[PDB]
């Protein structure tokens, strides 16, 4: 095999993919791992045997760094799986990781801002971000959209965001809703004294439509948009992040259809891959977990992928599946974004597990609270800000949540509806 | 019960928490020297506490992300030190907002900040109970 | 007679008729429920009850139909109970303007919107006598 | 006859028409029929006598999708009454209706802005909107016609008007028009508190002066322009419309030469044909009828048209004038703008007949009122606030419409002077 080098060193510049493969029956795993790999030839160098599985080897590729475009994630996804999932050899694949060398980092921009710039810029620091997601979902006049915000952000919710779905439809056009936006935003600022924010959606058909909802959002002065990158594409992602970048824009990540290539433990490629692949292409905020009843999925595998889209220098971690070290050198951070149904008992966890370098979300349109958006929102805040607190003296949040949220309940009547 | 929108201002970290008490404002910022951190006092008073867009017009292309008044005016070994430094601050400055900030020696960024007094002759905020009417 | 350019705001729907009485307010909120409509109360004071170009400075490009204060902050099943809800938000806020709005829950677009009180202690208004000198 | 196919059934994507004709003597009706129609060819499905009138029928003609070009009113216009008016074989000519299927209604944009996001914006809501045409209609400076309409506009009125035929003038540039009337806008907003507008005539020679005309408008930050539609073209029209919503302005539509084509009854196109191609157009107002005396026309033909610009789904009734079913598949709604002598007794008639979504416009220039304009303008809006409340409590207006003005007059000085 030309293509299977066992004693061969992976160069300080290789992109390196770590393959989970399920070759059928009679095809050595050896043959797999080279086939995939098959000066400029990408070479198996190693193939580990998964334990506790039926036939499963890890296979590590090496591929040269002169093989792709510079700053062109585009690229190296067509390269590593272009056309590597249809092999008939393999019962199943599934890319694990990616080392992206230093040499190839520094030819992309990154995030257009990054977490210490969006504190910085915002002003909020020591403790998470708060999100809401308007509800309905669709069928909301761009009046009642802002009404809605204004209402959410003004209880003390840091953000508000447009639906996943919502781009602009014949019920609610997206200049219309960016206006009406605006002026709930500026008025929430204005009531509270703090900096606010609505995740605006600019996605769109063509990146002229694009590009221009996002100039229109900097010509409101808005502070942050939105974009789904996994439907969008890579290329118009990369196109808003330079935007972004140029004209002092946020920009918030959706990951829409995410599940139809990170679901399956066989086949696909896992979301650590595209989280790396949206923190080199660019975002601020990167929709990385759902809270149905609690955080979903292995907690080390969301610790994992949560450091490798957060810290500079990740160490080689099978535990929490970091297959490869990654150094960013010095590309800044993307904020990881916890969304679901973050109910107030449930906030002491997700702090703990998070930190204070992530946005939690309330997706489900809270609403729950009695009283109304604003008060919901207030309670969500009060009940943050107490956890946050309790954590800063020493308390051990898994174990003391139930009871500083009673505690923070004792002196907020906005939580005490809510906390019932 | 509904949020008063009438001088109910806020001021980001532990601004929805009660008043924080000398005992609190010491954990808090023996937490902060805990992570290596250095606390410093930030002071404003009520006519430039608040964000505002007073000098938006003499820009243009774009104001985003720009605001007024998010730097306030700088007033570092243990939590009593710093206590110390807020009685004098609010000795000096009793008509002024006072916030505890937080910087990482070796990043050289900031990663703290919270509001620790609140002055009484400004009446532009509200109580935790009289926060909804 | 010349009408008064002084002290004479409006507010928009049946701004220009006498102060409804509250006979005239459950009438005009039960033709609200009739039609199939959902009755709520906005209310805000005088510094944020008119229009308002204030925000306009963060703006470029244009800023055509975009208006500050058109927004007022929320405060719903027959004329009695909102009437009810009229009156605490009467006590709760004295010097506020409240305003009953309407919205179309099937379409969900608002499709109502009158004043229905006028603060006593704010003079920014004219009564229906004094409106012309 | 090759395209006369009484057994045709049309497809749910063919347009429409529905043609008022009376042939020749000798001409049969199906030979006329099938002349009107000649896999893209016209054919002649349906044909029915008009009963009660002179050798009078009613031809039903059905078009391929494919013939027409998308979002085009110019070509749709320019295929089916291009050449067909000029047939010798028929004496008379009328086109009554068409048939828009939502295939073509969706390759339109339709109205900028629409009635409910114009009710948004301006942030009036239950009842009618008032305007005013600036009397004189020629011969004004531009400071006299802003002075007039700043008088107008302080007494209540929601919006004034350029004169149809006030374009730009040796007597008043249309910048300085322009100019004045912003600031009379501005003053009068900050005098009432209310949203305040002036339709500003856009029309002009060449799309290059329009489009800096809707600039110079845009730039100013006021709120709608006007438009002359059927003298300035389709092509003009589309191209305002588009940027009217590129840009967030309304756009006011006035009829000028409608009865050049529409006032015959044997001859011509239907203004409620006239009116479905403006709203596929685009225009958030249409100047839709004339209150000489009272309303004038068929009261049905007139509820037919307002209810096909108004609408989302208009059924066919023979008896108002719909030939056909017309969905709108979501397209934004046209508020039709009732013109002329509107005396103040006569308000609650048109209230009754047009409800809230209407614009009722005093083109008279009032001026009746002996005190002045603005405490006319007052009256006016009196009366019509007084007619709506009453209608809300359940009264029935075309019987006691003088006793709602009586009531309202007993209170109103401003409404005393006029209702003498």
């Known amino acids: 095999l030309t293509y299977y080098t066992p004693d061969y060193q992976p160069k300080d510049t290789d992109i390196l993919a770590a393959f989970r493969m399920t070759p059928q029956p009679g095809v050595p795993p050896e043959e797999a791992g080279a086939a995939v790999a ?15 599985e039926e036939n499963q080897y890890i296979a ?12 062109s994630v585009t690229n190296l996804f067509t390269s590593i799986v272009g056309n590597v999932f249809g092999f008939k050899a393999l019962r199943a694949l599934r890319l694990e990781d990616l080392r992206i060398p230093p040499a190839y980092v520094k030819t992309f921009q990154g995030p257009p801002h990054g977490i210490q710039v969006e504190r910085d810029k ?16 669709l069928g909301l006049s761009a009046k009642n959209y802002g009404r809605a915000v ?3 952000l003004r209880g003390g919710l840091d953000f508000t965001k447009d639906d996943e779905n919502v781009n602009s439809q014949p019920f609610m056009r997206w200049r219309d809703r960016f206006l009406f936006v605006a002026e709930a935003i500026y008025k929430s600022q204005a009531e509270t004294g703090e900096i606010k924010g609505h995740y605006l959606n600019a996605t769109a058909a063509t990146a002229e439509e694009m590009l221009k909802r996002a100039e229109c959002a900097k010509d409101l002065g808005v502070p942050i948009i939105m974009h789904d990158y996994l439907t969008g594409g890579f290329t118009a992602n990369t196109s808003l992040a330079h935007y972004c970048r140029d004209n002092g824009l946020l920009l918030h990540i959706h990951r829409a259809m995410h599940a139809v290539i990170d679901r399956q433990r066989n086949h696909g490629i896992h979301f650590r891959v595209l989280a790396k692949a949206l923190r080199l292409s660019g975002g601020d905020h990167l929709h990385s977990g759902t809270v149905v009843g609690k955080l979903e999925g292995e907690r080390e595998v969301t610790l994992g992928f949560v450091d490798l889209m957060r810290d500079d220098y990740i160490e080689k971690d099978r535990s929490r599946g970091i297959y490869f070290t990654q150094d960013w050198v010095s590309l800044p951070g993307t904020m990881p974004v916890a969304s679901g149904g973050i109910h107030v ?26 009283w109304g958006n604003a008060p919901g929102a207030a309670a969500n805040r009060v009940a943050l800000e107490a956890c946050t607190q309790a954590r800063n003296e020493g308390r051990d949040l898994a174990r003391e949540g139930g009871d500083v949220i009673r505690a923070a309940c004792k002196w907020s009547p906005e939580l005490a509806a809510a906390c019932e | 019960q509904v949020w008063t929108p009438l001088n109910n201002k806020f001021f980001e970290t532990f601004s929805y928490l009660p008043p924080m008490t000398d005992a609190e404002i010491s954990r808090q910022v023996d937490y902060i020297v805990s992570n290596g951190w250095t606390p410093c006092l930030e002071f404003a008073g009520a006519e430039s506490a608040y964000t505002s867009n007073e000098n938006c017009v003499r820009m243009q292309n774009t104001t985003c992300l720009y605001y007024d008044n998010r730097y306030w005016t700088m007033w570092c070994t243990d939590g009593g030190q710093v206590l110390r ?6 000795r000096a400055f009793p008509d002024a907002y006072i916030r505890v900030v ?32």
């Open chain 1, 345 to 370: 008992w449930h906030m002491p966890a997700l702090v703990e597990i998070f930190g204070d370098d992530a946005c939690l979300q309330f997706g489900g349109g809270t609403l729950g609270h009695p």
């Open chain 1, 38 to 52: 098959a000066r400029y030839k990408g070479r198996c160098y190693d193939i580990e045997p998964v334990p506790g």
């Open chain 1, 150 to 152: 204004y209402e959410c």
């Open chain 1, 122 to 137: 915002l002003n909020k620091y020591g403790r998470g971000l708060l999100g809401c997601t308007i509800k309905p979902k």
């Open chain 1, 60 to 71: 590590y590729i090496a591929y040269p760094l002169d093989l792709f475009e510079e700053g």
């Open chain 2, 102 to 133: 937080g910087f990482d020696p070796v990043r050289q960024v900031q990663v703290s900040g919270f509001l620790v007094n609140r002055p009484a002759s400004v009446r532009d905020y509200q109580g935790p109970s009289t926060r909804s009417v």
């Open chain 2, 85 to 90: 430094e807020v009685q004098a601050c609010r």
